[PDB]
Design a protein around this nucleic acid. Structure first.
Lengths: 79, 84, 97, 88, 73, 78, 84, 88
DNA sequence: TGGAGAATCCCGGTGCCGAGGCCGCTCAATTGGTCGTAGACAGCTCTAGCACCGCTTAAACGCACGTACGCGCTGTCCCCCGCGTTTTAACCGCCAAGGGGATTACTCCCTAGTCTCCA
DNA sequence: TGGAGACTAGGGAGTAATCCCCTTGGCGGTTAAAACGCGGGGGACAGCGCGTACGTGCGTTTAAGCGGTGCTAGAGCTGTCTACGACCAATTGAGCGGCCTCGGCACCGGGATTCTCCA
């Protein structure tokens, strides 16, 4: 599966960036689940914005608007 | 713009206000006030970003400097709590 | 032989009774005096409608109830039962306040 | 885009400090977001009292509402100064 | 996060909502940046939760709490 | 008058919140948090009132101040 | 509203859209769709509140019943996460 | 003030169950907030696409964005049904 | 394994005031023309997204093993809960003052609409 | 080609006054909670130990990365042009406040039933 592509080293690097020092072995499955939930919640809005404009190409602006709508505004990718 | 000493485009700001249908009518003072507020905020943010950049010994501004400036100041932090 | 409840049971009875009810849980006159004292700083000689004060009281009570729910969750997370200042501060810190 | 004006402001505050393409885009996005916030809040204020005109007072109220604390106070001072200078 | 596996994950997730979708590289990059930022913030909050509980090893019952407090699930 | 929020009031709020047992230092922190929240709401409410050139804070101003903070409130007009 | 088979005021909603300055022009389809969505949401919330009331043996909906209906359902709770 | 229409809807779903003044005000505030949310999102979508006309498509997209899951599905179905019945 | 004090609920008796229906009537919802134009549609350009496929190699993966530490156990004591007493001010009803919300009217001044020009 | 400038008229704004509604400020008085103090027990916690699992280094895949190769789907835009929506106006009826009634509910008394400790 592609979700398994987010392996242990990636989650460990993210945790080390977030301040965590020692990570339990069961964190990784929860981290993948949370990442999938977040990606679903952003992609639904992005795809809805894309379908509204009758386009088949998801662009940067759709993703930026989807993020800004979730109260997670992002800068540097247009708009 | 240049008449009031503000660098921001008062005319462009008025056009943006009218085009966006924010109001049926726009006073002659509102674009000047908005231009002043935007210019002050931009100047403050750029000054903080440059000051943060100077500690890094770099002569150019990068998104890391802007992120540091945003996360340092408390007021900007509350204004930009969820900005990446 | 006075029948005395063991420490804790009456707390749970109060929890059940209060969660079963809906009325406000803050004295109205001290809350109104507090609101006037706080609003004195922002504007001098203001006047509050009664409904505005009631709305402020309802909002404050709802916010405190939510904060205490999150504080109880934080306390249970640390295997304790007694919520403490380190539990309210964490619940506020996570929310971003 | 506000790239020219942001660039000039940055050169004014820091002549010896430059800006890259990504940093300029981030600053432009921040300026656009602030402008959208203030304009939307002024529109909401106008809609609340059903007054169809946006003046300096509406912008000042929106600045007080959106910007917090000392930023709001300084922005109010800057706007008042600019409007007074313009109308004179 | 690795670029190509995350791109495949994004395409797989988008497959369900609407079949036959084509992604600009900019949109994929923005999604990856947002995912990284959200995960970093969540892990910081989880670290706070685990420090509060007299521990240094974060656990799934800490991420769950740090998301329950925000109100994400 | 912040001391007017007596200990039994905070006890009742905590009991409603589901807290079984309270430390003795919660009360000062609860007063501080309540003051912070009231200041946050009242600043916006007074700003909305002062915009309309009035000296009487109304229910709509408080409701809008709550709605701008993410604490939308129903059943008080709008 | 009669032609659309709705209990909501299509005309009043159209007037609100036009006077609200949301957009310059409002197509004829928009008010009917918006009225239908509002009617469906109101019907759902009122049905949940009524079913909650029938459990509490009370024949008059009150804020407690509405709160119970909102918090017992997951979708509405997600919609009304920050609503009192 | 949607009180009469909310009362009619409640009678449609519950012929014998009434509603209190506070509950009626809560329902009215909820309807007003939902309507304002949908209208604001439709305005944002129209401005982003630069189309000055709000059609059924903008309202449909706004409903898909705001209402989650089953609520979104049923609301979109009801709106499409109502528009189809109105056009014919 | 039952007994005892505290606490809550069933049946029935009161009152109440707010929900429920009536009804002017007035202002907004429509329906019929009329006109200006944005959006539907067709068609053309080509930008950029998708798929193959080989060569590199850093990164993920599996194993071994030691040590930090997470969790169960235990006893000290302290400080919060339950409680009886007192004291204090929230709170209910009266009562007026009047200060500010609320139009109503009128003038007058400011901004949108139109035409011309240039950085 | 959008920003600047000048001319023109038409409607929102500021102001005055008045009307009266709601808020502020008292005052008397019954009384329901705050304040306070006194056991005591129970949970906070500080130390202990032991077994579990996580970090690190090492050897070995393996899929990411790049680059180079190709195509071609649809973004992007322009040109017609027609069905749509704004505007206006006579019409009329649906929702608004203000009148009423009455019945479902609030709350208590007497008594019955159930709950937390305890011998």
């Amino acid at each position: 599966d592609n979700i398994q592509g987010i392996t242990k080293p990636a989650i460990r690097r993210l945790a080390r960036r977030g301040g965590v020092k020692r990570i339990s072995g069961l964190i990784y499955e929860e981290t993948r689940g949370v990442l999938k939930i977040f990606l679903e919640n952003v992609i639904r809005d992005a795809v809805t914005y894309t379908e509204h404009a009758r386009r088949k190409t998801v662009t940067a602006m759709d993703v930026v608007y989807a993020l800004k709508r979730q109260g997670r505004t992002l800068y540097g990718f247009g708009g | 713009s240049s008449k009031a000493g503000l660098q921001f485009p008062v005319g462009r700001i008025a056009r943006f206000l009218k085009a966006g249908k924010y109001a049926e009518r726009v006073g002659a003072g509102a674009p000047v006030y908005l231009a002043a507020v935007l210019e002050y905020l931009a100047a403050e943010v750029l000054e903080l970003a440059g000051n943060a950049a100077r500690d890094n010994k770099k002569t150019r501004i990068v998104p890391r400097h802007i992120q540091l400036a945003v996360r340092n100041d408390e007021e900007l932090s509350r204004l930009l709590g969820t900005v990446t | 032989k006075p029948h005395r409840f063991r420490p804790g049971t009456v707390a749970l009875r109060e929890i059940r009774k209060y969660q079963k009810s809906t009325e406000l849980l803050i004295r109205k006159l001290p809350f109104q005096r507090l609101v006037r004292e706080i609003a004195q700083d922002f504007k001098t000689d203001l006047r509050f409608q009664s409904s505005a004060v009631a709305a402020l009281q309802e909002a404050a009570e709802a916010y405190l109830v939510g904060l205490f729910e999150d504080t109880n969750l934080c306390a249970i997370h640390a295997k304790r039962v007694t919520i403490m200042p380190k539990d309210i501060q964490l619940a506020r810190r996570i929310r971003g306040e | 885009t506000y790239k020219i004006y942001i660039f000039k402001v940055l050169k004014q505050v820091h002549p010896d400090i430059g800006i890259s393409s990504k940093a300029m885009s981030i600053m432009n996005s921040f300026i656009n977001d602030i402008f959208e916030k203030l304009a939307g809040e002024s529109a909401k204020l106008a809609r609340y009292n059903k007054k169809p005109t946006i003046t300096s007072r509406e912008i000042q109220t929106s600045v007080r509402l959106v910007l917090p604390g000392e930023l709001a106070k300084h922005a109010v001072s800057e706007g008042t100064k600019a409007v007074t200078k313009f109308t004179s | 996060i690795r670029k190509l596996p995350f791109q495949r994950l994004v395409r797989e997730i988008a497959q369900d909502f609407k079949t036959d979708l084509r992604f600009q590289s900019s949109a994929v990059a923005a999604l990856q940046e947002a995912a990284e930022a959200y995960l970093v913030g969540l892990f910081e909050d989880t670290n706070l939760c685990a420090i509060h509980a007299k521990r240094v090893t974060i656990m799934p019952k800490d991420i769950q709490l740090a998301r329950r407090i925000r109100g994400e699930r």
